[PDB]
Design a protein around this ligand. Structure first.
Ligand SMILES: CCCCC/C=C/C/C=C/C/C=C\C/C=C\CCCC(=O)O[C@H](COC(=O)CCCCCCCCCCCCCCCCC)COP(=O)(O)O[C@@H]1[C@H](O)[C@H](O)[C@@H](OP(=O)(O)O)[C@H](OP(=O)(O)O)[C@H]1O
Ligand SMILES: CCCCCCCC/C=C\CCCCCCCC(=O)OC[C@H](COP(=O)(O)OCC[N+](C)(C)C)OC(=O)CCCCCCC/C=C\CCCCCCCC
Ligand SMILES: CCCCCCCC/C=C\CCCCCCCC(=O)OC[C@H](COP(=O)(O)OCC[N+](C)(C)C)OC(=O)CCCCCCC/C=C\CCCCCCCC
Ligand SMILES: CCCCCCCC/C=C\CCCCCCCC(=O)OC[C@H](COP(=O)(O)OCC[N+](C)(C)C)OC(=O)CCCCCCC/C=C\CCCCCCCC
Ligand SMILES: CCCCCCCC/C=C\CCCCCCCC(=O)OC[C@H](COP(=O)(O)OCC[N+](C)(C)C)OC(=O)CCCCCCC/C=C\CCCCCCCC
Ligand SMILES: CCCCCCCC/C=C\CCCCCCCC(=O)OC[C@H](COP(=O)(O)OCC[N+](C)(C)C)OC(=O)CCCCCCC/C=C\CCCCCCCC
Ligand SMILES: Nc1ncnc2c1ncn2[C@@H]1O[C@H](COP(=O)(O)OP(=O)(O)OP(=O)(O)O)[C@@H](O)[C@H]1O
Ligand SMILES: [Ca+2]
Ligand SMILES: [Zn+2]
Lengths: 507, 109, 56
């Protein structure tokens, strides 16, 4: 930090310097005297078994506290991270299970693609044994469009493998046929599901313990249920594959947000629906008592009049109202017999229809389902805010990108080297594993803070790179305070000297 | 992206409803056609793509849902409650919720 | 150096020409306090010098 030649010679360029740089880490900590210092430590070997999937989840799952710091949750997850790393190190011995578990993401992605393709093919070619689409020119147009998209891979942007696989499946359908292709896809999907569940079991490590816990785990139940669904689709009937779309809906975040919004306002929706049911019941009672003859409905009888009296009982009136009035823009008045101006009950019919339209159709129906839309919009806004703040704010210190505007160190460097959550985790693991007798000053201080459950040693809105340049500005009121203290001390000393001189003169 | 995902969700729901109708309500998908200058009625939901197309078009373009095109049942039919539940679920799920969720973002933006 | 601090930021000479009297409120107090502290320091130094001379 003070010699330039040593820094030049310590650059990486089997290479000793490269190995040491790769296995060395640094962090910044705050001491009890509100001073920031940099601690450089070696990365313990155990930390090398942390999965990138776990890293990504810990990154894009944490929630800020009231103040706006994720350090509390990141520290609380340290024990789970250490246990997962230990389990991965243990699993490294097993070749087959580790090999299957390494590619868990691949199995899931290809299973997703297989399910989508199977559903699409079933929709476009079921039942089979007309195959009009097999000869219709539109299929050729889609094939050409997919070929153009695949050729556009020169520009990259991804989304190229999927159209290629779609074209391959189309060619397979053209050559072998539809049924053989569906059977092949189903067999591949079943094998993929088996491999994925095996990989999940290996990663979670419940197999080492009794299989009762493995079977008890909710995710294992989910996987086995969908395996049962897949085998049912493969053997009993093809249409059972449609149930797989529930897995896709659950996996996709945006689609699951709709269900989350519906579930969150469940009670309000139920109460408003009960109010609508009450109003429908009252209207049905009124109609049955005073408008029995006007509930005539038209029915297309299967291969005996074309009209029937609906509101004969009360349940029939309730059902007909709740169905037709709610499914018709104009209300219940669009199904009832059209009255004439000369009828006695024409004003009553007019009032009935207008009240139903204004109360049930325009107010209650909108009140039932406005909450869902509002919650969906709020969830989308919150997700956008979280994504924006995750890419323009440091995880640990919380400083924004604007601060690192013209400084010697950019925001990328600050988040890569200076303040690295993974480096902090490695330091925590090193403190927990290393013997107490061998602790240094900073290590003992951090261990004591951890034991006392205090998170003040993390940097909060402070960076050494920024303070290095802000020191001159910061040392403005401090100098004035020091000068005032020195003046007060000098005055006190002068007063003491005067008092001593007066006492000596008196004596 | 949000619009596309919501449209895919609507397509999934339409596919499920079409499957249910094809399996249990095949005979109720009768549509009226004005043939060009040979019956005036045709069976729409014979295949599965036809059911999907008819649903996605008519149910989405009709305020009351898919139940405004299907054959009107009678109180004495066995599947009358099933038809009622089908129509109400389609109206409450696809017409009132998903359709508005797809295009509210555009107005807000 | 790529510094944009030479542009005026929420400051205008026309406004400051009239706001000078109001602005020069805490500055005068600070100057008076500094002058008083300097006078006290000078008096203490003079007293110390006189005491040293008397002792010598
Ligand atoms: C390629 C398209 C080639 C088309 C050629 C011509 C044929 C044309 C007709 C139309 C095709 C339109 C299908 C369009 C969308 C295709 C899939 C799609 O774009 O949507 C996807 C997912 O939602 C669905 O699967 C959506 C479910 C689709 C419903 C399937 C049944 C439809 C049958 C009735 C419709 C009949 C229409 C009648 C007219 C979202 O898009 P995505 O890119 O984010 O998907 C990823 C991707 O799958 C990753 O592998 C996956 O990673 P893992 O989680 O690790 O497995 C990601 O998962 P997460 O991010 O959640 O962690 C997914 O999020
Ligand atoms: C005609 C109408 C058609 C449309 C009507 C709407 C249909 C709705 C579709 C989508 C909404 C339903 C989605 C249900 C999701 C169930 C679920 O969330 O499934 C997983 C849970 C896990 O449990 P957890 O919360 O402890 O895991 C939390 C930890 N994380 C997040 C890492 C897993 O397990 C379970 O519920 C196990 C459930 C087993 C399911 C077997 C299915 C075969
Ligand atoms: C989605 C619904 C899929 C229903 C499905 O594929 O029906 C399959 C079979 C229909 O053909 P078939 O051979 O029986 O009739 C003979 C038909 N011919 C002659 C054409 C072969 O119907 C059957 O199996 C009938 C017995 C079961 C019917 C109820 C199935 C309920 C399935 C799914 C809904 C709930 C899933 C879980 C949701 C939560 C997940 C988180
Ligand atoms: C696409 C389909 C179209 C529209 C959406 C319809 C949804 C129907 C209801 C499905 C309920 C369901 O699938 O629920 C699943 C949840 C399981 O949550 P989890 O912990 O596994 O989720 C983990 C993640 N986390 C904790 C953050 C939520 O179960 C629960 O919440 C348990 C039930 C809670 C109360 C539900 C209220 C029912 C509302 C009815 C009104 C419906 C009006 C429209 C007709
Ligand atoms: C809980 C709230 C209830 C509110 C009820 C009070 C509404 C406002 C107050 C009074 C309305 C008085 C209208 C006077 C009608 C007298 C009766 C009558 O005989 O005339 C009924 C007229 C149509 O004329 P017309 O049948 O005489 O035929 C003319 C040809 N000729 C003579 C050959 C038969 O219809 C009509 O005024 C029908 C008027 C229907 C009421 C207006 C809509 C209220 C909105 C509700 C939401
Ligand atoms: C995923 C959620 C599914 C929810 C399903 C459960 C809904 C609520 C629970 C139970 C409803 C029980 C209704 C009792 C009906 C018994 C069957 C029956 O025979 O009566 C069907 C009645 C009409 O009377 P009827 O055919 O006897 O004709 C009367 C004249 N006679 C006797 C000469 C033929 O219709 C009816 O209740 C049709 C009722 C249709 C269901 C109500 C709407 C549900 C909303 C969904 C959104
Ligand atoms: N404090 C932080 N603030 C913001 N993002 C961070 C922070 N710490 C880590 N990250 C994210 O993690 C990335 C660095 O993670 P990591 O060191 O594991 O990457 P890597 O690809 O494995 O590195 P390499 O292969 O060069 O060794 C950063 O680019 C950023 O995406
Ligand atoms: Ca020691
Ligand atoms: Zn930082």
């Amino acid at each position: 930090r003070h010699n330039k030649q040593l820094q030049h010679l310590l650059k990486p360029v089997e290479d000793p310097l490269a190995y040491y740089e790769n296995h060395t880490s640094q962090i910044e900590i705050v001491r009890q005297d509100r001073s920031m210092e940099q601690i450089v430590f070696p990365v313990p070997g155990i930390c090398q078994f942390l999965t990138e999937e776990t890293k990504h989840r810990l990154f894009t799952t944490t929630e800020q506290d009231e103040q706006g710091s994720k350090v509390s949750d990141f520290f609380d997850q340290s024990s789970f991270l250490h246990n997962e790393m230990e389990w991965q190190r243990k699993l490294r011995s097993m070749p087959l299970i580790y090999w299957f578990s390494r590619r868990m993401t691949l199995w899931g992605s290809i299973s997703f693609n297989l399910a989508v393709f199977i559903n699409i093919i079933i929709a476009f070619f079921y039942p089979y044994m007309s195959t009009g689409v097999l000869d219709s020119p539109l299929i050729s147009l889609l094939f050409w469009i997919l070929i153009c998209f695949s050729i556009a891979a020169l520009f990259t942007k991804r989304y190229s493998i999927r159209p290629l696989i779609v074209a391959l499946i189309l060619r397979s359908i053209y050559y072998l046929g539809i049924g053989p292709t569906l059977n092949i896809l189903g067999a591949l999907n079943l094998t993929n599901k088996i491999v994925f569940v095996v990989s999940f079991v290996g990663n979670r490590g419940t197999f080492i313990r009794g299989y009762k816990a493995m079977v008890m785990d909710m995710e294992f139940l989910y996987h086995v249920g969908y395996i049962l669904t897949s085998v049912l689709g493969l053997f009993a009937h093809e249409l059972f594959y449609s149930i797989l779309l529930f897995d896709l809906i659950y996996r996709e975040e945006t689609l699951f947000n709709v269900i989350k919004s519906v579930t969150r306002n469940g009670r309000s929706i139920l109460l408003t629906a009960l109010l609508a049911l009450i109003l429908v019941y009252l209207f049905s009672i009124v109609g049955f008592l005073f408008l029995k003859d006007d509930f005539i409905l038209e029915v297309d009888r299967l291969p005996l009049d074309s009209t029937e009296r609906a509101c004969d009982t009360l349940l029939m009136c309730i059902v007909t109202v709740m169905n037709h009035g709610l499914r018709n823009g104009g209300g219940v008045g669009d199904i009832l017999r059209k009255p004439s101006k000369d009828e006695s009950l024409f004003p009553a019919r007019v009032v009935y229809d207008l009240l139903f339209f204004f109360i049930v159709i325009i107010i209650v129906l909108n009140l039932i389902f406005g909450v869902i839309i509002d919650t969906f919009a709020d969830l989308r806004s919150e997700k956008q805010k979280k994504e924006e703040i995750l890419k323009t704010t440091c995880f640990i210190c919380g400083l924004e990108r604007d601060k690192f505007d013209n400084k010697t160190v950019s925001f990328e460097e600050h988040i890569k080297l200076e303040h690295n959550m993974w480096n902090y985790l490695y330091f925590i693991v090193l403190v927990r594993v290393k013997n107490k007798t061998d602790y240094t000053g900073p290590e003992s201080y951090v261990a004591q803070m951890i034991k006392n459950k205090n998170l003040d040693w993390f940097p909060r809105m402070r960076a050494m790179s920024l303070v290095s340049n802000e020191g001159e500005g910061e040392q403005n009121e401090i100098r004035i305070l020091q000068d005032k203290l020195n003046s007060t001390m000098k005055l006190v000393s002068h007063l003491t000297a005067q008092l001593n001189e007066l006492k000596e003169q008196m004596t």
